[PDB]
Write a protein that binds this ligand. Structure first.
Ligand SMILES: OC[C@H]1O[C@H](O[C@H]2[C@H](O)[C@@H](O)[C@H](O)O[C@@H]2CO)[C@H](O)[C@@H](O)[C@@H]1O
Ligand SMILES: OC[C@H]1O[C@H](O[C@H]2[C@H](O)[C@@H](O)[C@H](O)O[C@@H]2CO)[C@H](O)[C@@H](O)[C@@H]1O
Ligand SMILES: OC[C@H]1O[C@H](O)[C@H](O)[C@@H](O)[C@@H]1O
Ligand SMILES: [Ca+2]
Ligand SMILES: [Ca+2]
Length: 684
C-alpha cells in the first residue's frame, strides 16, 4: 500500500483531520438519546446532550459530505462510557456530552452508540478512505469530592461493569489525594487533580495494567490514531512506557495535548515531543496563526519565525498536529474577523508542515466564544461556502504533492503583510503567497522559487483572488498579489532516488515493525539501515515505491538514523530514531537526603540507554521532583525503563557546569517483568 492509503495508521502527514464533537454534529439515531435534564433537542443549552451520535457520522460519510470536503480522517470524542449523573456547578446543570468524564474505558458511551455501531463506524469510514482517530484521556475519571460521595459519581472507575474503585475510601491508592493543582509548577500539575477530576495514580500497577489493556481493545477495534488528553498532567515516564506497549502491539499515530499560551518555545514541551514516543498538537503554530490572521497582534515575520523555531525545536516537526482553533478556545471566526482571514488561515494551515486538523463547523463559519459556546451544534451541511471550497481544493494536495506532506519550508519573500513560502521534497515543489492586507495589493518583484521553467496556475482557481505565474528557472516574473489574495502554485514529478518522507513510529524495541514512507524506493526490496546495521531480507516485511515496513533489528538501545539504500543509491538519513532495550515498565526512583544548593538540580543516569548510558547531558533523567509525592531533600522521578533487567544507576547534582556524583558504588535494582515498581535509595 502507498504511504497515501487509509491503511497507513502510522502516518497522518498526507491526511487532513476533521475534529468533531460527536454530540454536536448529527443525531442519526434518536433512540439512543438521553432522557430528562440531561437532554435538549433544540440544543440551546450547550451544557446538555443534543443527541449527536456515531450513526450521524456514518450518515455523512455515506453521503460524501466529508469526501466532498476533502477530509481524510475524523477525530472523535472519547468513545468510552462516561458518568451518567448530572453535575450542578453553581446552578448550572452540566453533563458529560464532551466524553471527557469517563467511568469505564472498556465500554462505549451508549449515547454515542454500541460496540456494533462503533465497529460499523470504523468500517464505513475505512471503506471511504477515512481514518478514525479517538480522543483518550487516561489522566482521570470524572469530577469527584473526597468528602462527599454523592457529588457526581465520586469519580468511580469500572472495569467493564465491575467497580474498581472510587475517590472516597481509596484504600488501594488508585488515585492521587494530593488536592488540586494550582498550576504553579510542572510537578504540581502532574500529581494533583486537574480541576476536580479524580486523578489516577499510574504508579499503581492495576491502573497501569488497566490502561494498557484498555487501549489495546480500541486498537483491536481498528482505530487509526489517538489524541491523548492532558499529557502535561501525567508523568512522561508512564506515558513513554505506555507508548511502547502500544507500538509493540499495534502502532498507530499518537499525538498529545500539551497546552501552550504563545508561539514561544517551552523546554518541557519540546522535551516531551522529542522524548515521549508521541508527538503533540502544535499550540505554537496556533498562536502565531491566530496572532497574525485573526487578532492582528503580530505580523508575517512572527509567522516565519515560528516556522523556523519549531522546525529547530522538534525532532520531527512533521508529526505535530496544527489547527486554527479548538473546543478549548474562542472560535476563530468572530464578528470583527473577516471571512477572508479565516479562509487565508486555513489555506496556510493546509499547505504548511505538520498534520492539519479542522475543528468542525469552520467551513460553515461557526462562531462561539469560550466553553461551551465554541461547541455549538453543526448548523449546516452546505458545500457552498468559500471556506468549504478552499479545503476541498487544498486538502487533496497533501495526498498528491509530497512536498506539502513531507517537505521543508523556506521563505521566498516577505514583509509586514505579505508572506511567500516554499515547500520542497525531491523535485516536487509547492509555493504559497498570502497577502493579509484586505484593502491594498502588493507588487512582488524579485521572487525566486524552485519551480522549473513554465507558466503556473493558481491551484485555488482564483477563489481567493489568486493569479497565475511564469517561472524562468525559478525566476518568477513580477506580479501583483491582489488584496486579501492567496495563490498556490505547484510542480510534481516522479522521484527517481530513494528519498525518505517520514518514518513512524520513531521509537520501538527490537521486533517492532515501523513504516518508512517516501519516494523512489523502487519496487525491488533493498536494504534498510539502522545506523550501520543493514536490515535485509524477510525483516523488510514489504517494499514498494512509497512505503517500506521493516522490523527493528537487535542492535544496542540508542539513537539512530534511518537510511534506505535502493538499487545501490543511498537515501537521506531520517534522524533521531529511538531503539529501546526491550519492553518497558515504569519505575519510580526515590533518593533520600539529597540536599542541594540554590539552583542546583538532581538528575539520574545509569547503564541502559533509557537511563542515558552514564551521560550527564540531555539524555540523563531529570530534574527530579521534590514537592508533591515526596518533599525535599527527598527527590523522586518516574522513568520508563527496560523490564526484568538489572540496572546500575547513580544520581548527580548539576547547576551550571559542575557535576557532583554520588560517591560509593553504583546503586542496583532489578526491574520487574511487567507493570510498575519503586526503588528507594539514600544519597551516597
Ligand atoms: O471537567 C473539566 C473540563 O473537562 C473537559 O476539558 C478537557 C479539555 O476539553 C480537553 O481538551 C483536555 O484534554 O482535557 C480536559 C479535561 O478532560 C471539558 O471539555 C471541559 O468543558 C470541562 O470543563
Ligand atoms: O562515566 C562512566 C562511569 O560513571 C560512574 O562513575 C562515576 C563514579 O560513580 C563517581 O564516583 C566518580 O566521581 O565519577 C565516575 C565517572 O563519572 C559509574 O559509577 C561507572 O560505573 C561508570 O563506568
Ligand atoms: O480546558 C481545560 C484545560 O485545563 C488545563 O489548561 C489543561 O492543561 C488542559 O489539558 C485542559 O484542556
Ligand atoms: Ca443520539
Ligand atoms: Ca495527573
Amino acid at each position: 500500500d502507498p504511504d497515501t492509503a487509509v491503511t497507513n495508521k502510522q502516518s497522518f502527514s498526507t491526511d487532513v483531520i476533521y475534529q468533531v464533537f460527536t454530540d454536536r454534529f448529527l443525531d442519526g439515531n434518536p433512540s439512543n438519546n438521553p432522557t430528562g435534564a440531561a437532554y435538549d433537542a433544540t440544543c440551546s443549552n450547550l451544557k446538555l446532550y443534543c443527541g449527536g451520535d456515531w450513526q450521524g457520522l456514518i450518515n455523512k460519510i455515506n453521503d460524501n459530505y466529508f469526501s466532498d470536503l476533502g477530509v481524510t480522517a475524523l477525530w472523535i470524542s472519547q468513545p468510552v462510557e462516561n458518568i451518567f449523573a448530572t453535575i450542578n456547578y453553581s446552578g448550572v446543570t452540566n453533563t458529560a456530552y464532551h466524553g471527557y468524564w469517563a467511568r469505564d474505558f472498556k465500554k462505549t458511551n451508549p449515547y454515542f452508540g454500541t460496540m456494533a455501531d462503533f465497529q460499523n463506524l470504523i468500517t464505513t469510514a475505512h471503506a471511504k478512505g477515512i481514518k478514525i482517530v479517538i480522543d483518550f484521556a487516561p489522566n482521570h475519571t470524572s469530577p469527584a469530592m473526597e468528602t462527599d460521595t454523592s457529588f457526581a459519581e465520586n469519580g468511580r472507575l469500572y472495569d467493564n461493569g465491575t467497580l474498581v474503585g472510587g475517590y472516597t475510601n481509596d484504600t488501594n491508592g488508585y488515585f492521587h489525594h494530593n488536592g488540586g493543582s494550582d498550576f504553579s509548577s510542572l510537578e504540581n500539575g502532574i500529581y494533583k487533580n486537574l480541576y476536580d477530576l479524580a486523578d489516577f495514580n499510574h504508579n499503581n500497577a492495576t491502573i497501569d495494567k488497566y490502561f494498557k489493556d484498555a487501549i489495546k481493545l480500541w486498537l483491536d477495534m481498528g482505530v487509526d490514531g489517538i489524541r491523548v488528553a492532558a499529557v502535561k498532567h501525567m508523568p512522561l515516564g508512564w506515558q513513554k512506557s505506555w507508548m511502547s506497549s502500544i507500538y509493540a502491539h499495534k502502532p498507530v499515530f499518537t499525538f498529545g495535548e500539551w497546552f501552550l499560551g504563545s508561539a514561544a518555545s517551552d523546554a518541557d514541551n519540546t522535551d516531551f515531543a522529542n522524548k515521549s514516543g508521541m508527538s503533540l498538537l502544535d499550540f505554537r503554530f496556533n498562536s502565531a496563526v491566530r496572532n497574525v490572521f485573526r487578532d492582528n497582534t503580530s505580523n508575517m515575520y512572527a509567522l516565519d519565525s515560528m516556522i523556523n523555531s519549531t522546525a529547530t525545536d522538534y525532532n520531527q516537526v512533521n508529526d505535530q498536529v496544527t489547527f486554527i482553533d479548538n473546543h478549548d478556545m474562542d472560535r476563530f471566526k468572530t464578528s470583527a474577523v473577516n471571512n477572508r482571514r479565516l479562509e487565508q488561515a486555513l489555506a496556510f494551515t493546509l499547505t504548511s508542515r505538520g498534520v492539519p486538523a479542522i475543528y468542525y463547523g469552520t467551513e460553515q463559519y461557526l462562531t462561539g466564544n469560550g466553553d461551551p459556546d465554541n461547541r455549538a451544534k453543526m448548523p449546516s451541511f452546505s458545500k457552498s461556502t468559500t471556506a468549504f471550497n478552499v479545503i476541498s481544493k487544498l486538502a487533496p494536495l497533501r495526498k498528491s504533492n509530497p512536498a506539502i506532506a513531507y517537505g521543508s519550508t523556506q521563505q521566498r519573500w516577505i514583509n509586514n503583510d505579505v508572506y511567500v513560502y516554499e515547500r520542497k521534497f525531491g523535485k516536487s515543489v509547492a509555493v504559497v503567497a498570502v497577502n493579509r492586507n484586505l484593502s491594498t495589493s502588493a507588487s512582488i518583484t524579485g521572487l525566486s522559487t524552485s519551480l522549473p521553467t513554465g507558466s503556473y496556475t493558481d491551484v485555488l482557481g482564483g477563489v481567493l483572488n489568486g493569479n497565475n505565474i511564469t517561472s524562468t528557472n525559478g525566476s518568477i516574473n513580477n506580479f501583483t498579489l491582489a488584496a486579501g489574495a492567496t495563490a498556490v502554485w505547484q510542480y510534481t514529478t516522479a522521484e527517481t532516488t530513494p528519498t525518505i518522507g517520514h518514518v513512524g513510529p520513531v521509537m520501538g524495541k527490537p521486533g517492532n515493525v515501523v513504516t518508512i514512507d517516501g519516494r523512489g524506493f523502487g519496487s525491488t526490496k533493498g536494504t534498510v539501515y539502522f545506523g550501520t546495521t543493514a536490515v535485509t531480507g524477510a525483516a523488510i516485511t514489504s517494499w514498494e515505491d512509497t512505503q517500506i515496513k521493516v522490523t527493528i533489528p537487535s542492535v544496542a538501545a540508542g539513537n539512530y538514523a534511518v537510511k534506505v539504500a535502493a538499487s545501490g543509491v543511498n537515501s537521506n538519513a531520517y534522524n533521531n530514531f529511538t531503539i529501546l532495550t526491550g519492553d518497558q515498565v515504569t519505575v519510580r526512583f526515590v533518593v533520600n537526603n539529597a540536599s542541594t544548593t540554590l539552583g542546583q538540580n538532581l538528575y539520574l543516569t545509569g547503564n541502559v540507554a533509557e537511563l542515558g548510558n552514564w551521560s550527564t547531558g540531555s539524555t540523563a533523567i531529570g530534574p527530579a521532583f521534590n514537592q508533591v509525592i515526596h518533599q525535599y531533600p527527598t527527590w523522586y522521578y518516574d522513568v520508563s525503563v527496560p523490564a526484568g533487567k538489572q540496572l546500575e544507576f547513580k544520581f548527580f547534582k548539576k547547576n551550571g557546569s559542575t557535576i557532583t556524583w554520588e560517591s560509593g558504588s553504583n546503586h542496583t535494582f532489578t526491574t520487574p517483568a511487567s507493570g510498575t515498581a519503586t526503588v528507594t535509595v539514600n544519597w551516597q
